[model samples]
Target: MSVLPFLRIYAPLNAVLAAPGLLAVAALTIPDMSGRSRLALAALLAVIWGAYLLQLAATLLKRRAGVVRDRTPKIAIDVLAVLVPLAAFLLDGSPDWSLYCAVWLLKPLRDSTFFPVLGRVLANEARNLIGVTTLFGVVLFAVALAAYVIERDIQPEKFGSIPQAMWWAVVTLSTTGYGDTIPQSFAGRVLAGAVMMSGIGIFGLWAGILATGFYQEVRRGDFVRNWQLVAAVPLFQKLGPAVLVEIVRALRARTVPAGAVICRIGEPGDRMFFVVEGSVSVATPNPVELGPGAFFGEMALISGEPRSATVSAATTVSLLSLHSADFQMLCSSSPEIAEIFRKTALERRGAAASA
Candidate 1:
């Protein structure tokens, strides 16, 4: 049987276990560690290494199973995860081989979805980033030139050259104020004050640019993911493409853990939820439960009343919630879909009333 799928799931677990093992490895370096504690740490690291080797072997055996989406990066990382420390141990012949376990740090990057999003943000914002960096360089040089002119004669050693003055400029510009070199003259002190302000403004500009870029990229990723989830739902798939796009935009995604309450009875329903990946329980008289592609809470939005029943996640559920404002917009723009929602609302209400 293909074991790669099971091995693939071990990635997060591996990262979690690596934290404690890495901590133990760090503890071994403490100057006063006892021999028994050192031995225990060594044993722990060996166990962690053994787990990685088992993962590596499984990866190799299941090579043709095609469980991973991008096999090259993952398998390469796995190979390095096992081999790098072993290579260090064999070649270095020192206790420092444990430090090579730092290679496991790369494991989280391989499995993280955020890295790809961050990469996209960086790529998309490259031009603006370069512009901000150029601004920073220009400000750095300008402040350094001003500082050299103002302070060079007064404190020849510290501000004798543009490069020397540039160090002070960098310290002041970052607002770090290491205070190794100080400007004694009135004009030079004024220049330092100006440099600090400029540094703050320049850094703020770059932060704003990056923050905006990340926000847009993350929103784009969510919209695309929500679109896929919407398509998976039987209700939305039959809807027209244009309408589907509107619904996707209307929906906001969230995840609820197993056994968590999603909604409470008699609470005002400001939103409805569509189950994208797991099940939720609706506490009607007979306690109706819904699974992926099923939706609930439309009745409150339709009737403008408090929720009739409590709804809780039956499992760890991926949900797309539709807010009242968006729900109204969707109903107005798509009358037939609105009709379908109204029908469902009535059916659910009738069912609950009868039961």
Candidate 2:
């Protein structure tokens, strides 16, 4: 490919990368723009850049602390900063579209050196969801309060009290417009309109943050859960890290509640289980118990035999369940996983016989 065509494509990409800084600088220098307009524009850029900064800081912090370590409180600070400009834009009727433009600027930031670390910190979907939700709730409540306090006197029906105003606030913030209530007075109408506009911007940012965080969290959770399971199986324990990772990729994680039956006797046996953290009771004509680090259902996988024993969780359990399909795939992809499974199955059988 010629360099000129590549440069043509790269030019717009470059403009998008530079947009936040450029817009921020322009907003700062523009003498004619009102204080509210300038502040709103600046806040929009700050929120977008601040998310990148937080991702960077969190990544570095996790390296020092550890990925599993909770940095929820710190993450909350960044979430709040992002919301501040959003809240200002919503509450004041300033052009908040700038926030979206700022968010687009994150593409360049993510490609920079800091992305890998920041990526790790955002891998916790549950944590990110909770943090962003909490911030949204706070902002929603604050805006609702202000609307009620300011507009209640003039438009009693529309902005009656905090609770009533909250309905309006939610509709406005969400940009849903159920049309149950609307401002009547001059001041009330302007405030209501501003809130409605802000709602659009806020919802966009909220969705973006959630979607990005959720994707990362799921990927991280899957890797960690499967890797830990691979490490626990004795046959795979002696393998090098790279081989172990290959084994890990072959397993799937599942959770079951106490008393839930995982496998029934005489059922088509398609998968084997490795207990991660919990206990299971194996019921045959005789009953046996399996705890953390135990394996079960191997006979089915190895011999294609019907399940001889029914396995039920003795307590809430996290398990790595490797299906026959996954086993076959891994056997074809990397012989190590299949070898480990076969050896572990045999060893368990031997131990049972010796006992």
Candidate 3:
């Protein structure tokens, strides 16, 4: 029971135990690596670290990688990785195992497939909002029920019934502070305060998650819509993937109802359109028709004059529109898209002038 005996047993063993854990920590904290590559490297590092820990338990054990039933191999690796440092700490009573545990935790958390899937699921706006609201509703009901059961005899007016207590809970949880139903007893007030604080924190988290999910969904939808159009357009057919990606990034899709005038006969054009669905009529003084996959409005961009003819949707249509600013940006970023734009514009101009 002497302090010296405890120190001798724990100290040197703890120092030896901390060695592999330190290596793992250093592998993560040293941060010049790219994220995808970092995760891959960290996972590999964790496996190696786990193997080293296993060897420490019995040096004769040979390392081999193979799948085991029920994910037993993976679970065994995790346990060995953790236990090795724990054993070291026990032999020499030091806190070095804490660092090892932390690094081990970092590897699993960083490499977890569950988080990415969970993130995708939670990132869906409708799903997240429904889940958060359902959770809030359940917590509200449970807390309200408990409060009513506790306070009904003393503050009968406020906690008179389950429904009445729920009203108070909602108001407090929303932090509305209407003051219509104040809890009288000390415990009731304490519970009310706790509910209010929890309400604020939970609602704030819910709102932040919803806002992030909505923003991402909107961006994803926009990208997918534009990607479909970019893939459909024959003008972009010859471009390589790099240029196609540039075009997709530059273009924005718009939908218009049948008979809606997209461009007038004499308006300065700032954008071009590529029809991906339905058709449009490009009416010159004599009128002409264009179908899906055809593009128009190039004359204005080329001639720097008013549009020569009115272009109106013939049916409900989906069109990819590229504005002058985006056009210039794309051209600047990817010279190939610019070349394609230039070639198409020139051919279009010649065709229009000849007609």
Best by TM-score: 1
Record all residue pairs in model 2 with backbone atoms less than 3 Å apart, i.e. clashing. none
lDDT of 2 by residue, 134-197 (tens): 8778877877787676766767776668888777778777867788777665655666666756
Off by over 4 Å in 2: 1-173, 180-205, 222-230, 238-240, 243-260, 268-270, 276-280, 284-292, 301-306, 313-318, 336-355
**Stretches of candidate 1 above 4 Å error?**
1-11, 63-69, 150-164, 237-242, 253-258, 276-278, 315-318, 353-355
Clashes of 1: 0
- Write the number of the candidate with greater TM-score, choosing between 1 and 3: 1
Candidate 1 per-residue C-alpha lDDT over 180-251 given as tens digits, one digit per residue, 9 for 90 to 100: 888787877666557767878887787888778688777566587766675577876456667665656545
Taking the tens digit of each residue's C-alpha lDDT, what string does model 3 give over 234-289?
Answer: 66665666656555644566677777777777767677777778877667543456
State the displacement of the C-alpha of residue 330, model 3, in Å, after optimal TM-score superposition.
2.3
lDDT of 2 at 195: 70
Candidate with the greatest lDDT versus the true structure: 1
Cα lDDT, model 3, residue 9: 23
Cα lDDT listed for each candidate: 0.75, 0.62, 0.62
Backbone steric clashes in candidate 2, count: 0
lDDT ranking, best first: 1, 3, 2
